[PDB]
Amino acid sequence: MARKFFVGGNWKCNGTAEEVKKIVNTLNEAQVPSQDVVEVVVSPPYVFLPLVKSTLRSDFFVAAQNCWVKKGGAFTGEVSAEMLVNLDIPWVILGHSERRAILNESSEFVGDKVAYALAQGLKVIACVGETLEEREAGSTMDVVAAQTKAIADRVTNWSNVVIAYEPVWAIGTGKVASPAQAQEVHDELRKWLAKNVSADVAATTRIIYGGSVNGGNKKELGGQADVDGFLVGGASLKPEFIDIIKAAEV
């Protein structure tokens, strides 16, 4: 069965109570393709997770932007996966490029987070991606395979995993990734999954594009053979997020 298009919206470290109410209302009024056609996840900061879950339309789902690597306890400042389950938050973003780079989350740390989140019943958007230095060194697939392998070695089930490829080398560097460049990485990543995990896992796992997506490139990006949707950054705070969801209609 074909992979269901997936659109996640990462709000990052943004939001006020008034802004969140506006974003949620605009999402609630949106008219988008059916749940059979597209799966929509929105990810507010921790402090807004109960508010968004309590007010968002029930056919869009809520994600935390991170969670802790293991059971709760003496980890001041962290939020455990079981906390998210207690609050009926079904999804979590793990390994986002900003946490790998600015907060120095290693691939093994991320992989341990994915496994623990899955073991608590969460669904995971697992992020991978190479930097500009890594791409110019010709290490793109070496880096992305190593990041993916660290996850693969630690999980027991891929059913509730979505992989997000982030072309970090293009974000904020001035460079711009083409739909062909994105398809190139996605194809190779899915090929890695078929070889190293299983053909079934490669065929069924959504691999979403985490680079710059707008009205101009959304159709061409979403139509790529191995691109199954988007992990949206800043546009997820804006009405145009709805336009990006509408790319699922083909």
Residues forming the site for Na ion (CB under 5 A): 227
CB of 103 to its own copies, least distance (A): 7
Q: Does 174 bind its own copies (CB under 8 A)?
A: no
Q: How many Å apart are CA 56 and CA 62, to the nearest integer?
A: 8
Binding-site member from 31, 73, 138, 250 for its own copies (CB under 8 A): 73
Mark the segment that binds its own copies (CB under 8 A) among 14-22, 27-35, 213-221, 238-246: 14-22
Q: Is 249 a catalytic residue?
A: no
CB of 230 to its own copies, least distance (A): 15
Q: How many Å apart are CA 154 and CA 139, to the nearest integer?
A: 23
State whether the Cα torsion 167-100-128-75 is positive or negative. Answer: negative
Smaller CB separation from its own copies, 14 or 139: 14
Q: Does 68 bind its own copies (CB under 8 A)?
A: yes
Kindly state the tokens that stand for 247.
Answer: 């790319």
Kindly state the tokens that stand for 238.
Answer: 């804006």
Q: In degrees rounded to 5, what are phi and psi of residue 5?
A: -55, 140
Kindly state the tokens that stand for 173.
Answer: 């560097």
Q: Does 79 bind its own copies (CB under 8 A)?
A: yes
Smaller CB separation from Na ion, 24 or 227: 227
- Residue 181 per-residue DSSP state: H
Smaller CB separation from its own copies, 66 or 147: 66
List beta partners, residue 5. Answer: 38
Q: Are 233 and 12 in contact (CB under 8 A)?
A: yes
Binding-site member from 61, 62, 66, 177 for its own copies (CB under 8 A): 66
Q: Are 210 and 163 in contact (CB under 8 A)?
A: no
Q: Is 166 a catalytic residue?
A: yes
Size of the site for its own copies (CB under 8 A): 39
Give the HSE-up count for residue 127: Cα atoms under 13 Å, Cβ half-sphere: 27
Q: Does 33 bind its own copies (CB under 8 A)?
A: no
Q: How many Å apart are CA 217 and CA 214, to the nearest integer?
A: 6
Binding residue per annotation — 12?
Answer: yes
- Provide the residue type at 175 as one letter: K
| Residues 73, 74, 77, 81, Cα dihedral to 10° | -20
In the set 96, 105, 130, 186, the catalytic residue is: 96
Q: Does 76 bind its own copies (CB under 8 A)?
A: yes
Binding-site residue set for substrate: 10, 12
Binding-site residue set: 10, 12
Positions in the binding site for its own copies (CB under 8 A) = 10, 12-17, 45-47, 49-51, 65-66, 68, 72-80, 83-84, 86-87, 93, 96-99, 102-104, 233-234
Q: Which residues are catalytic?
A: 96, 166
